[PDB]
Design a protein around this ligand. Structure first.
Ligand SMILES: COCCN1C(=O)c2cc(-c3nc(Nc4ccnn4C)ncc3C)[nH]c2C[C@@H]1C
Length: 343
């Protein structure tokens, strides 16, 4: 029973030689040697039972990832848990090991246009598939984008992922949000729950901008500051953009701000490709209805060397549609049942 960074992993004895990769609010990720397959693997310990919200996410993550099979999305190779509900303390997810993630790469390495183009291609290919299943990732960021020696890109961390619910998206001004701040679409701050596909497109734009400069484009130090970084670049939203925001608190806040002009993409990224900046402009659109969809982003002249509709698969069976009320105990039961097949 090895330990890492204060947590105990009950992966014995099939997986050994552990090391630590990442941490989460209710989960930890570590590398391990798998004897059966004779290769290095990623193991995700998830402790969601104490809290209810964590149980919902965990069930959603396991169900989504078991559903998916895509070259650009992390899969589940195995699920380790205790044989009984009473003995089930933690849930262990075995996934393929990736060399690193885009966050780590960006901290130390300059990316060439070729790498940028190809990374964006694989993100959009993976996202096209996620979206075709009627799934929103909701937490796209460089640390959720894994890479290997040959530059293959895989999307991971589906804990915050939900089935799309456009009808129930509207909400009040300054409504709290879980997902990473720097990659939040401006609507989240003003009138959205993050229940539409356009939410992920905005995150992809932020990543593209971070690939062009090795620095986050909108590094807001707090909830409101995030919005003011966005408007600082995008300029004051148009009359037509403001008209789509009907809740008055959000509208009156935008109207009270002094007029700021749109900073040009070329001035922010002078070394960037002109086609790359044209796509970035489309992704980073203040109005979510005017924002480019994943399939149009793939069809963009910046990705014409990789664009192939036939080689961009979509989900065979999309998710159709209530864990919000279900307590930690009933959720522990569904998690146990969803992980049964791996015993
Ligand atoms: C606790 O959960 C929080 C969310 N979260 C993940 O689920 C997860 C999974 C991986 C992961 N990471 C690598 N390798 C890699 C990334 C960075 N350095 N190295 C060696 N290989 C495979 C996987 C599946 N990375 C992450 C990022 C965070 C930690």
């Amino acid at each position: 029973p090895e330990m890492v960074r204060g947590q105990v992993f009950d992966v014995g004895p099939r997986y050994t030689n552990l090391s630590y990769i990442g941490e989460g609010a209710y989960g930890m990720v570590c590398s391990a040697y798998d004897n059966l397959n004779k290769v290095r693997v990623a193991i995700k310990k998830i402790s969601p039972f104490e809290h209810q919200t964590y149980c919902q996410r965990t069930l959603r993550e396991i169900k989504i990832l078991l559903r998916f099979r895509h070259e650009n999305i992390i899969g589940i190779n195995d699920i380790i848990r205790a044989p009984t509900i009473e003995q089930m303390k933690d849930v262990y997810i075995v996934q393929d090991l990736m060399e690193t993630d885009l966050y780590k790469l960006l901290k130390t390495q300059h990316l060439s246009n070729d790498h940028i183009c190809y990374f964006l291609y694989q993100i959009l290919r993976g996202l096209k598939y996620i979206h075709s299943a009627n799934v929103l990732h909701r937490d796209l960021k460089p640390s959720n984008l894994l890479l290997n020696t040959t530059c293959d890109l895989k999307i991971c961390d589906f804990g915050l992922a939900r089935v799309a619910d456009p009808d129930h998206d509207h909400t009040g001004f300054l409504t709290e949000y879980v997902a990473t701040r720097w990659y939040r679409a401006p609507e989240i701050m003003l009138n959205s729950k993050g229940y539409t596909k356009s939410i992920d497109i905005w995150s992809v734009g932020c990543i593209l901008a971070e690939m062009l400069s090795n620095r986050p484009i909108f590094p807001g130090k707090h909830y409101l500051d995030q919005l003011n970084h966005i408007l600082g670049i995008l300029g004051s939203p148009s009359q037509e953009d403001l008209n789509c925001i009907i809740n008055l608190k959000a509208r009156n806040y935008l109207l009270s701000l002094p007029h700021k002009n749109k900073v040009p993409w070329n001035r922010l990224f002078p070394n960037a490709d002109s086609k790359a900046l044209d796509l970035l402009d489309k992704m980073l659109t203040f109005n979510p209805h005017k924002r480019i969809e994943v399939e149009q982003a793939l069809a963009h002249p910046y990705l014409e060397q990789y664009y192939d509709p036939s080689d961009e698969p979509i989900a065979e069976a999309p998710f159709k549609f209530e864990l919000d009320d279900l307590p930690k105990e009933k959720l522990k039961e569904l998690i146990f049942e969803e992980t049964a097949r791996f015993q």
